[PDB]
Design a protein around this nucleic acid. Structure first.
Lengths: 147, 247, 194, 50, 257, 133, 53
RNA sequence: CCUUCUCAAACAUUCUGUUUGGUAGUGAGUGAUACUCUUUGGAGUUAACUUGAAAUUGCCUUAAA
């Protein structure tokens, strides 16, 4: 979880203040006297379930605590269907922090800088081994039989 | 419990520090023996960074100079090696946020390159020295009757008489004289004020103090660089500005 | 006779040939006329000045370019099966059909008029042993190149699609939708099969 | 394959036009003089609050 | 001075050995092409394994036809320039094309020291980056830092290991000092390493380049600079695993042993 | 069943016997630790073996470190069955060159060089090459 | 329907570097930053040419 | 979960030229005859190629709580 965020923190969507100051810098320079497309985490449920099924998702992070639970119930199994390497991470607040929002429910990482590419591919393989392989029994077994 | 990541990080950083210290050790040994046949450079540069940050590049003269070495805490994951334990024991700078006066000669300067990632150096002014001694000062001597390890304060001048006296030193201002001007009694009084106890920067973990530590922590790597090469130019900084922050 | 290559190493092997055979006059045959609109854009972009022939372009262009290939010395064209019927040039050494053909029987008549070979992992003269190490490392360069032009994203889109549509409208037992799309996409350089 | 065969738009590859709209709105605001540029905002505080 | 007649006879025997009785060129073409001139000595740099490339001055460029018809070859020839952190902030690729298309050389990619330690720090990404390029150029300062940033596999060849180029006019960076030194390294110099052992081959490259009369001038000047600077033992011209061609043979250097 | 001896692979660049003993000591009292290294130069092959005095301690360490993302490559740990002990892995340092040279006289090696050189000219003639001098 | 200062200066750059080779003009990453077609370019340039000489 | 030895002289000013010195590298494997030394042991070299940083055992503490 800490290692997923050590990557995900490098792609904070440009906050409202940062975007405002930069786009006034564009105006103050370009009006008087080339850039690549920048990469950020992708964070709406309409947009994540858009990105997944279009296979534009390499790592989809799903919150475990959602206000109506029914919202995000299809998502882990739709990710297993599409072949999208997903990880159910703990905390919608903790996802919220990396994305300028209070809460996010979902966070995705479509494209990446090449410096972070190998780390992301290994993050996929670590999550496949740590999450998907340890929890193959979780598609079975009704939870909550605690005496 | 010690995490795995930290325990590998310590070794991975000390690998760089052991190899770095050995590298500087070789070039400084080969510089002294006059066997300058095939090395990087056979002379000594000093970098003086002032304040918009101008990097000067001036060669070190043979002249004896006066430095005030200040302890930093750096770098991150490093454990200090044997060659660092030795020099920092001799300068009595085991404690973080701690200063000392030494004269800089052709023997002192090679040892300065070893401890440069741990210390921040510079030539102080008369006010930096004089205000530092009249604000901070320790004297290790006997207590009431039995206890020895009391370090109290430079409150008096009669204490100065009892401990120094016959060398020509009578008062605290006379100690300031033999420290600012390089004289006979400098080796006498330098080990009398053993080290100084500078307060740390910002000095808190909280709301304002974390953000102020963040601002200063990014100001560190701008106002100080780790050269890591055997021909590392010694970074000299303004001590008048730095001790304005630390007093 | 033939070369055995996977759908990943298909266009990889083709591109490896065209650079070394710049001096010669070789012929590449495709099934679709919407596949050549992709290849004759990539190779002109990566500076192997090939010629373009398909049904979707005008007749005066189709005549005045193919005429130039006949009068050339060093040239190379990309043309389909159906468009190159009846107008064959003797100035040739390699007749290399890339896609599976229209008629499995009429292709024999296409040859004996030049050296013939095919490409088949999912599916006389001699076979050709092929080194795995000396393929050109222009794939990730093409993967970056596809997702940053749009025009070449669209021509690759209708390159991959038209090729695979023609692959399904075949008649043989060999060519009947067996090839997986996780390999065929990387021929046109994709992360997902469009 | 992905579920739908929707053609990808030009705007997913081309530099954004919403960004261009905002920039060319602030440009007007600087010509009019109602937004003071970021370069002069330093000069307004270098002279004041001393 | 070495006999030029024996050099002509050597290359003629190399022509005969290359004219002897698959769809890709895996090994057959390299063993056909690759000439190497061996230079032997009693312990070259006997105790220090430094990675300096000795820039042996040659009258005629072999890199030029190496460009012209590596354009035909599958492995392309592309010119790399490793610079320092202020240089790319100062100088673009377009200025390099402005001043180097005049003679006709092309800078492929300019690379910062930052890029080798962040984006090309992944091992497969690093290996596949450098192995693409044949001419590796590096500004004097960064050269000493480069065994760590690009690793050991980049140093196992002679192509992939960098050449120290001066870009500083009295420590200040100038474009002109780069512009003329790139020319001198390219057309007037052949790089070769110095191992801690005895044997050293000089990668002259493809036999097909610079008609054999020119190859004599190449070999002549190489010997004119390697026997003058160092006392040496033996010289052999060799295409990959031929019966060797003994060219120079000395009996006065061994007397000191 | 299983045994106290453990196999660890995919080790970080600079994770040696010092840190294998120190970190896995926190799991409990380890018996004997090794790490396979190159002999040409003293550095890790990125895999090693260590043994615990307790078999149950071996399986607990395996449960907690089987997929552990640790500075660019995830640790792989495997238990061993009864037998297959830790045998022959030596601490190899950086091996240095030793200068064995002259001993023989200059006139011996000169005529040895003459013998090898004249046979060298008599070697090209064996396979289709004629070369003067 | 006239043209803006920035649009005019953009078409100045395209004409001065290329001229009339619309294939090369639209495959240029530096000047045709918006990946526009040939028809858009010839229409906009003729608007630029009618308002100028 | 730290990030890597980011330049010096001697001579020369053609708007920067010449010369001198500076780098110890992830591991594992495939590999076609040559080089000297050693006396039998490989010692050290010499093309090239494979690879998600891959792998089964060669005899200081305010960088804290």
């Amino acid at each position: 979880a800490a290692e997923t965020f050590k990557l995900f923190n490098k792609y904070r969507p440009e906050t409202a203040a940062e975007k405002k100051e930069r786009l006034t810098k564009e105006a103050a320079a370009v009006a008087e006297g080339a850039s690549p497309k920048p990469y950020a985490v992708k964070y709406g449920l309409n947009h994540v379930v858009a990105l997944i099924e279009n296979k534009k998702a390499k790592l989809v992070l799903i919150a475990n605590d959602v206000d109506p639970i029914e919202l995000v119930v299809f998502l882990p199994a739709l990710c297993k269907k599409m072949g999208v390497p997903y990880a159910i991470v703990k905390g919608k607040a903790r996802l919220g922090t990396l994305v300028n929002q209070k809460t996010s429910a979902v966070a995705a990482l479509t494209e990446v800088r090449a410096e972070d590419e190998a780390a992301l591919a290994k993050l996929v393989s670590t999550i496949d081994a740590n999450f998907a392989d340890k929890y193959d029994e979780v598609k079975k077994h009704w939870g909550g039989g605690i005496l | 419990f010690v995490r795995a990541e930290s325990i590998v990080a310590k070794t991975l950083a000390t690998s760089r520090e052991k190899e770095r210290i050995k590298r500087v050790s070789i070039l400084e040994d080969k510089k002294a023996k006059n066997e300058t046949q095939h090395i990087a450079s056979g002379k000594d540069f000093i970098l003086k960074i002032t304040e918009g940050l101008i990097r000067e590049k001036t060669t070190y003269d043979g002249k004896p100079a006066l430095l005030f070495i200040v302890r930093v805490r750096g770098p991150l994951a490093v454990n200090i090696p044997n060659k660092a334990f030795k020099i920092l024991s001799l300068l009595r700078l085991v404690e973080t946020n701690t200063g000392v006066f030494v004269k800089l000669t052709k023997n002192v300067y090679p040892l300065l390159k070893v401890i440069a990632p741990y210390v921040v150096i510079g030539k102080p002014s008369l006010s930096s020295i004089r205000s530092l001694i009249q604000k901070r000062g320790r004297i290790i001597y006997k207590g009431e009757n039995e206890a020895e390890p009391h370090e109290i304060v430079l409150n008096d001048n009669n204490i100065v008489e009892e401990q120094l006296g016959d060398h020509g030193i009578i008062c605290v201002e006379d100690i300031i004289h033999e420290i600012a001007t390089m004289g006979e009694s400098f080796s006498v009084c330098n080990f009398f004020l053993q080290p100084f106890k500078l307060n740390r920067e910002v000095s808190g973990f909280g709301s304002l103090n974390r953000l102020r530590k963040i601002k200063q922590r990014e100001a560190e790597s701008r106002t100080r660089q780790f050269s890591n090469a055997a021909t590392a130019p010694v970074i000299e900084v303004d001590i008048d500005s730095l001790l304005a922050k630390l007093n | 006779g033939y070369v055995v290559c996977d759908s990943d190493k298909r266009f990889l092997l083709l591109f490896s040939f065209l650079k070394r055979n710049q001096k010669k006059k070789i012929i590449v045959f495709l099934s679709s006329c919407n596949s050549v609109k992709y290849y004759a854009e990539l190779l002109n972009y990566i500076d192997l000045p090939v010629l373009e022939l398909h049904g979707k372009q005008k007749q005066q262009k189709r005549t005045n370019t193919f005429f130039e290939f006949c009068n050339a010395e060093r040239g190379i064209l990309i043309c389909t099966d159906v468009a190159a019927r009846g107008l064959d040039i003797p100035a040739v050494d390699w007749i290399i059909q890339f896609d599976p053909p229209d008629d499995p029987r009429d292709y024999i008549h296409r040859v004996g008029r030049g050296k013939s070979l095919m490409f088949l992992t999912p599916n006389p003269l001699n076979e050709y042993e092929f080194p795995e190490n000396k393929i050109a490392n222009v794939q990730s360069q093409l993967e970056k190149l596809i997702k940053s032009n749009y025009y070449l994203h669209q021509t690759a889109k209708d390159g991959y699609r038209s090729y695979l549509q023609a692959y399904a409208s075949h008649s043989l037992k060999t060519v009947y939708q067996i090839d997986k799309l996780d390999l065929a996409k990387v021929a046109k350089s994709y992360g997902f099969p469009v | 394959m992905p579920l739908t065969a929707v053609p990808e738009p030009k705007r997913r590859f081309v530099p954004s036009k919403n960004e261009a709209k905002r920039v060319m709105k602030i440009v007007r605001a600087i010509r009019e003089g109602r937004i003071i540029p970021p370069k002069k905002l330093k000069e307004m505080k270098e002279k004041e609050k001393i | 001075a070495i006999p030029r007649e024996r050099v002509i006879k050597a290359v003629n025997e190399l022509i005969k050995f290359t004219s002897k009785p698959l769809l890709e060129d895996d090994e057959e073409e390299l063993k056909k092409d690759l000439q190497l001139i061996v230079v032997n000595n009693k312990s070259f740099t006997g105790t220090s394994k430094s990675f300096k490339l000795k820039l042996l001055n040659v009258k005629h460029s072999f890199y030029k036809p190496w460009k012209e018809a590596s354009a035909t070859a599958v492995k392309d020839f592309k010119v790399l320039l490793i610079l320092k952190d202020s240089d790319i902030k100062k100088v673009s690729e377009d200025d390099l094309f402005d001043q180097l298309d005049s003679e006709g050389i092309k800078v492929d990619e300019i690379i910062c020291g930052k890029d080798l330690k962040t984006v090309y720090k992944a091992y497969e990404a690093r290996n596949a980056f450098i192995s693409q390029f044949s001419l590796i150029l590096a500004d004097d300062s960064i050269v000493t830092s480069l065994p760590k940033l690009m690793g050991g596999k980049a140093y196992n060849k002679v192509e992939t290991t960098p050449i120290s180029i001066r870009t500083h006019a009295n420590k200040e960076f100038s474009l002109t000092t780069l512009t003329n030194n790139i020319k001198k390294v390219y057309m007037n110099q052949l790089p070769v390493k110095l191992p801690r052992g005895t044997t050293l081959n000089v990668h002259l490259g493809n036999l097909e380049w610079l008609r054999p009369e020119e190859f004599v001038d190449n070999v002549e000047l190489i010997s004119e600079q390697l026997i003058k600077a160092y006392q040496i033992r033996s010289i052999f011209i060799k295409t990959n695993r031929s019966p060797v061609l003994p060219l120079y043979y000395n009996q006065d250097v061994l007397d000191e042993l | 069943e299983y045994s106290g001896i453990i196999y660890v692979s995919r080790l970080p660049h600079g994770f040696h016997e010092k840190e294998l003993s120190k970190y896995f000591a926190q799991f409990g009292d380890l018996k004997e630790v090794r790490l396979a290294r190159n002999k040409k130069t003293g550095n890790s092959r990125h895999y090693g073996f260590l043994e615990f005095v307790n078999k149950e301690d071996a399986m607990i360490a395996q449960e907690s470190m089987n997929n552990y993302l640790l500075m660019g490559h995830l640790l792989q740990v495997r238990v061993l069955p009864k037998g297959a002990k830790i045998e022959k892995l030596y601490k190899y340092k950086k091996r240095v060159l030793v200068e064995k040279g002259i001993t023989k006289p200059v006139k011996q090696l000169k005529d040895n060089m003459k013998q090898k050189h004249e046979e060298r000219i008599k070697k090209l003639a064996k396979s289709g090459i004629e070369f003067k001098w | 329907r006239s043209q803006s200062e920035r649009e005019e200066e953009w078409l100045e750059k395209l004409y001065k570097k290329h001229g009339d080779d619309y294939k090369k003009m639209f495959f240029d990453k530096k000047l045709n930053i918006y990946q526009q077609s040939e028809g858009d370019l010839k229409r906009r340039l003729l608007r630029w040419k009618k308002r100028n000489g």
